[PDB]
Write a protein that binds this ligand. Structure first.
Ligand code: NI
Ligand code: NI
Ligand code: NI
Ligand code: NI
Ligand code: NI
Ligand code: NI
Lengths: 101, 566, 100, 566, 566, 100
C-alpha cells in the first residue's frame, strides 16, 4: 500500500502518428554546446549546427514533448524530424519565416 | 517515435487505462478518457513546449486564456478524464487540448503571452467543495474550510453568541447587513441564512429582502408546524431555500406531522440521520420523499469505534443543555443511536442521502467535510464491495456518486449551481489541485475565481518555495481588492433588486440564487434514491423494503494518523 | 509537512504544556492555564498512542491532584475538552472534574 | 410552583440578596435588585423559552431588539442589578424584562425573529473600559486593550518614534490625518491628542481643526507656564480637553506656579502621584483643586514589594535619559517616592483620585488598567475595611466607586460620555461579559457597537467552540466594513465642521466631543473628594488635614499568578 | 565650554574623523563631514533641547517639517556625513541643521509643534533598498523584504504557479489588473513586469497599457532573437524597461547572437554571472557593453565553501527540470561554474556589475540582498585590499560603490529614480535606521513615505517597548489607508494616461516610470566599468585584458551566525 | 532578539520536531509530518554546528529508517529540503530519499 500509487498498464504510446517525418545528419561546428527542444523550428536553430536547413523547413524534432537533443562541440548525429501541424504558420525563432509554411 | 507507458505516466501523468489510488484508501480510479494528441502535450519549464512560436502563440489577450492547468486528471460527477483546463475572466473557459494552433493540431485552449501556467501533470483537479451547514461562530472557520478544499460556505450566525452556537441563523436586517459587509473580508463565496422560526410572514420577508438566500428552521427557536408552514410559504414566494432541524422532542407532533406541515414543498433536511437534531428516533425516514433534499453532518461519518462515546457531551454544549436536568439529558440520549448512525453510511452508498456538510463547531468539524466523505466511501467499498452501477475493475462510479455529495448537489439544493458546483464551462473557476497521495486531505493549490487563494508554502526567505517549514499561507487571491474580485456574495433576488449591494457598499462580486423551489430528490446527481424506509420505534432498527440496513464500526481509518501532526 | 491551521494551533497547546511540565517538575503548584495545558496535552498523546475515547475520559482525571495545583484551580476547571486524531479520525474527549 | 434559591441560582444566575466574590479577591457584591418576574425568565436552548409563539413574538424588526443579553448581572456606577439587556441599532435599547408581550407579563424588551441571543445567566456584564493615556507606540496595543475589556482608547503618537515613546502627542496636521486614517483599522473607539507645547495659539488651532480631541502638555516638550496658558486658551475656545504632565524639574517654577498658570481652568492631570512625571515631589497636591480631574497611571497601582525596584530603569528608557549623566539620574530618582506611591492607593479609596489609566509602553501596562484597579480596591478593603458610604454586608459602594474610575469618569473628562462610558439607554453598545471567577482578568465576550469583536475561542476545527486550545481571537465585529460600522472615531467640533471625515475618507462612524471645559471635580462619579492635602518637602510625607496618609506594600496579589501562564 | 570627543560621541554620535565598524565585518567608515554647529545639536527627552521656545519654534505646520531624524550618520552614494534629516509631506525636505531659528544659528530644518522626532544619534541612516528581481510567488515576501531594509520591489508573478516559480512575469491584462489591486495591501512600493516573450508587438503593448513598467524575457518562455527584438521595439516606444534571462541552451544562437539581436538597445541583464540563467558559459561577457545594465542575483554572493553544493537541486526545482532526464541535468550542470562564480565577486568590486538583487524563491533569497552585498564587500577588502579610488584610511569609497548597487542603480535602471533610490531632497521618505552593530542585518526602524512601517517591538503589555520578546511587527505605516498614502504603485506612462488607476480603483499613491531607454552603463553610480572581458569556452576561465579574474571561497562570513537564531 | 519572520517561522519547525522526537522516544512509528519535521530539525542543528552542506546531504539519510515510520511514509517523502545559517551564510540542504 503506497498512498496515491499508480497502476500503469504495460505497453507503449506511439507519438505524432500520421505525420510526415524526415531524417537529417546534424553537426555542431561551434565551440560551445547546443541543446534543442521538441517543438523548436529546427530550420532556425543556432547557425553553428550544420545541416540541410531546406529539408528541415516546417519541421521539429520527433521526440517526446518537453524533451531535448543535446549537441556537444563537434558532435555529429542523425535526428528524426516531424512536420508542424495546425495552420503551419511559423512565427518567432530567428525571424526567418514569420508567416505560413 | 514511441515511449513506454510508465515513462509517459512519470512525465505527463497517467492516461487512458491507468489506475490511481486515492490517498491511502482502497479506492482506485481509472482514467476514462484523454483529450490530448500523443506527442503534442504542453509542458512548461526550461527548454520545454510552452515557449514563443512553439506551444505559445501570437494571439492577443482576448483570443487566449488567462490560465491553463496542464495535463490535469479531472475527477468530477460527469467523468474522470485527462485534459488541459482553460480559465478566462475568472471562469472555466474550456476542457480540452491547450497549445498553439499555428503549429499544433486540435488546439481548443489557446495559449498566448497573456497566459499563466499551472502544471497539473500527475495531479488530480476537482471543483471547490460547498458546505451548506455553516455556523458563523468565528471568522477563522473560512480559512480552515478553504485549506480543506471548500470554496463556498452557506450558513448563518453573528459570532460566538448563544443563538449561533446552536443554530445557523443570522437574525434580522441589522445582523444580516453587518455579516454581508463582513463577508467581503473572507476568501470564500458566502450566502447567508436567516431565522425562519416565526408565524408572521412579514418578519421573514424582511430578512429575505435584507439579503439572506435561505431560512433556517431550528427546534431551539421552535420547529412547530405553524413556523414551518410560514417559512415554506415565503420561500415559494421569494425563491429561496429552507433548511430544517425538526422537533426532536415530538412536542408539536411526530415526524409524520412535520412531513404533513411541509406539504410536499421543497425543503433541505439537515443532519437527516438524527444525532444533530430531529424527530427521535425516525427523522431519517425523510429520505423517502421526493421533495426532501437530505444531507448529513460529519461527526457521524463514518461509523467508528469512538463515535458514540464522544457525542453526549458534544450535544450538551452545543444546544445549551443542563446535564443536571434529567429531561435535558434524556433528550440528548434519545438523539444518539447506534442503529441510525450505522444505517446512514449505507444510505449514502445507495444514494438515499444526497449531501454531506459540516455543522461547523455545532456538532460538526469545518475542515473535515471532504475527508470524512471519502472515509465513508472507503468503508463502504470494504464492507459492501462494488456498486451495481459500477463497470470495469475500478471505483469510478462510487467516486462520482460521493464527490457529487459536496459539490454539485449542495449547489443545486441552494440555487447556486449556475455559478459553482462543478468543473463546467461558464462556471466560476473555483478549483482544487491535489497530489494523489494527499487527495481529500491536504491540497496542493486552492484557486478562487481564477487566482490562487491559499496553498502550502515553504520558507519565505528560501531559494525556492519548497524548503521547510511548509504550511498553508494565504496568497494574492485572498488579498484586499483581488479577493473581492475573486469571490461571490450570494443574494436573494429581492435583495439584489432592492439595491442592497449598493446600500451596504459591498465590494465583492454579487451573484443571485434561483431555482430553489423547483429542485427535487430526482435532481440530485447520482443520489436520487427514494427508499421504502422504516424505523422500529422501540429497537430503532432501520429497514428498507423490510431488509435490515446496518454496518460495522471502523477501528482504524485512512486519511487520519498518517497525515496529521496532532 | 503541509501543516493546516488546526495542526499549527495544536502546536501552541503542546508548547504551553511544556511550560507546565517543567514547573511541575520543579515542585510548583500549577495555576489555571498550566493545569489545562498539561491535561490537554496528555490526552492528545493518548490519542496518538491509539487509546480509546472512553479510556482517556477516565485517565485524564488522574493527571493532576488537588495537592498539585493552587487553591481554587480545581473549581475553575469543571471539565476539559480537546480533540485529536485517533486511529479512527478526530474525536472529542471530555474529562469531567479532572482535578480531585 | 416553587424552586430552591440554590437551584434557581444555578439555572438563571443569582438574584436579590445573593452575593458573589469578584475573581479571587476579597470583594463581594450583592444583587441589589432583580427586574424579572419569577417564572417568566427567558432562556435559550433546545426546549427552552425563547421559541416562536412562546418567549419569541411575531413583531417586525423595527418593533424588537437586535440582541438580548439574558439574565445578566449588571455592575455599573448606578447599581448592581439582575436584568435582561436589549441592544438595537448598535446601541443600548433598554435594561429590563425581555420576552414576548403576547403571552408574558411586564415585557419591556421585545424578542422577535430579528433577535439574536447571548446567554448571560451566571455572568457579570459591565461597560467597556476607557483608557485615556495611550501612547500609540504600536497598533498591537489595541488588541491587547480590547482583550482586557477596554473598548475606547484616547491618546497620541505616530508609532515607535522618540517623541511618542515619551509623550501622548500626534504632532501636526499630516500625522494627525495619517493616524485618523489608520484608526479605521483598529477595533476600538479612538480619539487623538495633539502636541500642546507651544506659545503660538494658531499652531494649536491647526491641530484641533485637523482632528484632535485634546492637547497634551508634556515636560519633554517644555511644560512651561506660557505653553500651559496658550493650550488652555485654545481649549476654552474649541471645547477640547487638556492633559498635563508638569515640570518635574521645577525649572520654570514650583507646583503652585503651574497651578497659577492654569488659573482655575479645567484640566486633566496625568499620573497625579508623580512617578510618571510632575513637579517633584508635590504634584499630588493637585487633587485638592475643583478644576483638576486627576488620574493615575498603572505601574504604581497598587503599592507592592517590587514596585520601587522596577521603576528607575523603566523611567530612564521611557524619557530617553542617560544613566551616565548625573543630572539625568538625579531627576529620575526624584520622581520615585515610596511616600507618594503609598498615599495614592488611599486617595483612590477616598475618591480624591478619579481615574485610572495605563500610560501604555511609556511607564504603564496597556492590558492592566482594569486588573490593577481591582487589586487596589482589594488591598484597600484588606487594610481599611468598609467605606463610610457602605451599607449592608457587601462591598457594593466600593465596587461602584472603583468601576467609575475606568468607565464613566474618563468619558466625562474627555467629553465623550454622551456616546460611551456606562450601560445607559442611548449609549453605544460596548459591553464586556465576565465569568465571576475571571472578573477583571479574562472576559468571556467583548462586544463593540452591538457585535462581538473578540472573545476566547477554542479549536476552529472542533465539533464545538470549547475544546482546547482556547485563546483570544478576533471575531466578525473586528472585520473590515463590519468593524467600521461598530467603532467610533472622535473628532473635535471644528474638524467635524471642516469636513475632515469626508476629506480623509474615514470609513468608521464619527462622533464629536463636547463638554470638556465645563466638567469639574464635583462631576466625577463617586470620586469628587477635594482633600486638604499637603506634602512635606523634605520627607515627602503626604497628609490630609494633618493626618498622615499611608499604606503597606502587598507581598502577594489576587488576579495574578492563578490566571497567567507567564 | 569644551567636551571630550569620546563623551561627545556617546552623546550625539560620532563626528568628523571618527570611524565606525559596519556590523562584524572589517569595513570601516569615516565621518567625512558634520553639518552641525557644536553646542547647538538638538536632542529630545526630559530636560533636553527640543522644547517650546528652545529647540522648538512657534511656526505653523506649513513652515516646519513633520518629522526630524536627529544626529543621523548618513551613508549614501554621495557621502557619509553627520546631519539632521527633515521630512515633510512624506518626502525628504532637507539634510542639514535642525532647530529653532529664533534662538539657534544656522537652522535649515525648522522644528515646531507639528514636528515629530526620531532620535538617530549613534545610528546610521540609509535609503530603502530596491529589489528589481522579485518573483511574486507569495505575498509574505513583502514583509520579509521590508524587514531586511528593502522598500521597493519590482518583479512579476501571480502566486505559486509554475510560470511564476520560474519567471518574473505577470501574464496579461487580467492578471496584471488583479496584481495591481493586490499591491495596495502590501507595505512596499511595487512595479510589475509582464511576459515579454512573444513576436507580436500588440500582445506586448496590451500588457504595458494594462500597467506593467517593464517586460521580462525568459528562456523558459523562449528567449529567441525574434522575441527579444519584439520586446525591445515596444520598450523603445513606451518608455519601459526590459529584463533579460537569455538562452542558456544556445538553442537559437550563442551569446554574440543575442547581443546582436539586442542591437545596442538599453536592457537590464538579470543574474549576468550565469547560474541563475543565461548563455552557457559566457553570458557574463555582457558586462562589457555600454547598453547593458548588469545585475547579480544573491545565491552566488559571495563565493563560499557551500555555494556549489547547494545549487544543482535549487536549479532543478525552480525551472521544473527532471533529474531523470539526462538533457535536463546536463543543462543544469552547464549553468554552475566555480570559475564564473568566483569572478563575479571581483567584477562587483571593480564596478563592472552594477546591481544586486534577490530572485526571490526562484534561485534567490528575498531577505538577503543587502546582507549579501556587504559580505561581498567584506570578502573583497579581505582579499584585494583598498580600492584605487580610496582616499584616507577607511573604506568610504568601497562602501559608496556597494550601497549604490541596491539603491540608486536599481532605481535608475527601471526609471523610478525620480521618486526613490537615495536620500535626496524631493524623493519619497523611504529610510532605514540601523544600529552600527546590526548594520545590514537587522534594522532599528523602517520608514515608508514618512511613517514607520515596521520595526522591532517588545512586549506589547510591557511598561516600555524594550522588554523581550523583541521581534519585527507591523506599525501604523502598514495599516489600511495610512499604508495607501505611504506607498507607491508604479505605472507605465500609457497605463497612467488610460486611467488604469481610476478603473481598477487603486487606492495607493501612483507614480509613473520614465527614462528607461536613455540609461546606460556610464550612468551607473560608481559602477560604470566596461571591461575587456573574455571567457574560455573549455575551461570557463574569466579574463579581463588577459588577466585571470578569480577569488577564494569563504569558510566563514560576517553577518551570519552571530545574528540569526536559525 | 530582533527576530525576523524567517527566524520565527523556523521556531515552528523546531517545535514540530520536539513533538516527533518525544513520540519516537515512546517507540511509535512516525507519520508523514513527524518524519519531515524530525529530519529537518536535525539538519538545522547540523548547520549550527558548522557541518558542510555535503556532509548533511548524506547524514540526513540516516536519521530515520523504514522500520521507524508508518507504511507509505518513505514513498511520501522523495526528498527533504531546508535552509539554515551555516558559518558561511544561508545554504540549502537537499536530502534525497531520506528514509530507506
Ligand atoms: Ni441542527
Ligand atoms: Ni447546525
Ligand atoms: Ni507623562
Ligand atoms: Ni505618558
Ligand atoms: Ni532568471
Ligand atoms: Ni528569476
Amino acid at each position: 500500500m503506497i498512498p496515491g500509487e499508480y497502476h500503469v498498464k504495460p505497453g507503449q504510446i506511439a507519438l505524432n502518428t500520421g505525420r510526415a517525418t524526415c531524417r537529417v545528419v546534424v553537426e555542431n561546428h561551434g565551440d560551445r554546446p547546443i541543446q534543442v527542444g521538441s517543438h523548436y523550428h529546427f530550420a532556425e536553430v543556432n547557425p553553428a549546427l550544420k545541416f540541410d536547413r531546406q529539408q528541415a523547413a516546417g519541421y521539429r524534432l520527433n521526440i517526446p514533448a518537453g524533451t531535448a537533443v543535446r549537441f556537444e562541440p563537434g558532435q555529429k548525429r542523425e535526428v528524426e524530424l516531424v512536420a508542424f501541424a495546425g495552420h503551419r504558420a511559423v512565427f518567432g525563432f530567428r525571424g526567418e519565416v514569420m508567416g505560413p509554411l | 517515435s514511441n515511449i513506454s507507458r510508465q515513462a509517459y505516466a512519470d512525465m505527463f501523468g497517467p492516461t487512458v487505462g491507468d489506475k490511481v489510488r486515492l490517498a491511502d484508501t482502497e479506492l482506485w480510479i481509472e482514467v476514462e478518457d484523454d483529450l490530448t494528441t500523443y506527442g503534442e502535450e504542453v509542458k512548461f519549464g526550461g527548454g520545454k513546449v510552452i515557449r514563443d512560436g512553439m506551444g505559445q502563440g501570437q494571439m492577443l489577450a482576448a483570443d487566449c486564456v488567462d490560465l491553463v492547468l496542464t495535463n490535469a486528471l479531472i475527477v468530477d460527477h460527469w467523468g474522470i478524464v485527462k485534459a488541459d483546463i482553460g480559465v478566462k475572466d475568472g471562469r472555466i473557459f474550456a476542457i480540452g487540448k491547450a497549445g498553439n494552433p499555428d503549429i499544433q493540431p486540435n488546439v481548443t485552449i489557446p495559449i498566448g503571452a497573456a497566459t499563466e501556467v499551472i502544471a497539473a501533470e500527475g495531479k488530480i483537479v476537482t471543483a471547490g467543495g460547498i458546505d451548506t451547514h455553516i455556523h458563523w461562530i468565528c471568522p477563522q472557520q473560512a480559512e480552515e474550510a478553504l485549506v480543506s478544499g471548500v470554496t463556498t460556505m452557506v450558513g448563518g450566525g453573528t459570532g460566538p453568541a448563544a443563538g449561533t452556537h446552536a443554530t445557523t441563523c443570522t437574525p434580522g436586517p441589522w445582523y444580516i447587513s453587518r455579516m454581508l459587509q463582513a463577508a467581503d473580508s473572507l476568501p470564500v463565496n458566502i450566502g447567508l441564512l436567516g431565522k425562519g422560526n416565526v408565524s408572521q410572514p412579514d418578519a421573514l420577508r424582511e430578512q429575505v429582502a435584507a439579503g439572506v438566500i435561505g431560512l433556517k428552521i431550528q427546534e431551539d427557536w421552535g420547529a412547530t408546524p405553524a413556523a414551518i408552514d410560514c417559512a415554506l410559504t415565503v420561500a415559494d414566494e421569494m425563491d429561496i431555500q429552507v433548511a430544517l432541524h425538526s422537533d426532536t422532542l415530538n412536542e408539536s407532533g411526530f415526524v409524520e406531522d412535520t412531513l404533513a406541515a411541509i406539504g410536499g414543498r421543497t425543503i433541505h433536511t439537515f443532519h437527516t440521520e438524527g444525532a444533530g437534531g430531529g424527530h427521535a428516533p425516525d427523522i431519517i425516514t425523510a429520505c423517502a420523499h421526493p421533495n426532501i433534499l437530505p444531507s448529513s453532518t460529519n461527526p457521524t461519518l463514518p461509523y467508528t469505534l469512538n463515535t458514540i462515546d464522544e457525542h453526549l457531551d458534544m450535544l450538551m454544549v452545543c444546544h445549551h443543555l443542563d446535564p443536571d436536568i434529567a429531561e435535558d439529558v434524556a433528550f440528548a440520549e434519545s438523539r444518539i443511536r447506534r442503529e441510525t448512525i450505522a444505517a446512514e453510511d449505507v444510505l449514502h452508498d445507495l444514494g438515499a442521502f444526497s449531501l454531506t456538510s459540516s455543522d461547523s463547531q455545532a456538532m460538526g468539524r469545518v475542515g473535515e467535510v471532504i475527508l470524512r466523505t471519502w472515509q465513508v466511501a472507503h468503508r463502504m467499498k470494504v464492507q459492501r464491495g462494488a456498486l451495481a452501477e459500477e463497470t470495469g475493475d475500478n471505483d469510478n462510479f462510487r467516486v462520482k456518486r460521493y464527490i457529487a455529495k459536496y459539490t454539485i448537489n449542495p449547489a443545486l439544493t441552494h440555487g447556486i449551481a449556475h455559478e459553482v458546483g462543478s468543473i463546467e464551462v461558464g462556471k466560476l473557476a473555483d478549483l482544487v489541485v491535489w497530489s494523489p497521495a494527499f487527495f481529500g486531505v491536504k491540497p496542493a493549490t486552492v484557486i478562487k475565481g481564477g487566482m490562487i487563494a491559499i496553498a502550502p508554502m515553504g520558507d519565505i526567505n528560501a531559494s525556492i518555495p519548497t524548503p521547510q517549514p511548509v504550511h498553508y499561507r494565504p496568497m494574492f487571491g485572498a488579498l484586499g481588492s483581488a479577493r473581492h474580485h475573486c469571490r461571490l456574495t450570494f443574494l436573494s433576488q429581492a435583495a439584489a433588486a432592492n439595491g442592497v449591494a449598493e446600500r451596504l457598499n459591498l465590494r465583492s462580486a454579487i451573484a443571485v440564487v434561483k431555482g430553489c423551489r423547483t429542485v427535487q430528490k430526482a435532481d440530485m446527481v447520482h443520489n436520487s434514491l427514494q427508499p421504502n424506509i422504516t424505523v422500529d420505534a422501540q429497537t430503532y432498527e432501520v429497514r428498507v423494503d423490510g431488509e435490515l440496513i446496518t454496518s460495522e464500526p471502523a477501528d482504524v481509518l485512512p486519511m487520519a494518523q498518517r497525515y496529521f501532526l496532532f | 509537512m503541509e501543516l493546516t491551521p488546526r495542526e499549527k494551533d495544536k502546536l501552541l497547546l503542546f508548547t504551553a504544556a511544556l511550560v507546565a511540565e517543567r514547573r511541575l517538575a520543579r515542585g510548583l503548584k500549577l495555576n489555571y492555564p498550566e493545569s489545562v495545558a498539561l491535561i490537554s496535552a496528555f490526552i492528545m498523546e493518548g490519542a496518538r498512542d491509539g487509546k480509546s475515547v472512553a479510556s482517556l475520559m477516565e485517565e485524564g482525571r488522574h493527571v493532576l491532584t488537588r495537592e498539585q495545583v493552587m487553591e481554587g484551580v480545581p473549581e475553575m476547571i469543571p471539565d476539559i475538552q480537546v480533540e485529536a486524531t485517533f486511529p479512527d479520525g478526530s474525536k472529542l474527549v471530555t474529562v469531567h472534574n479532572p482535578i480531585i
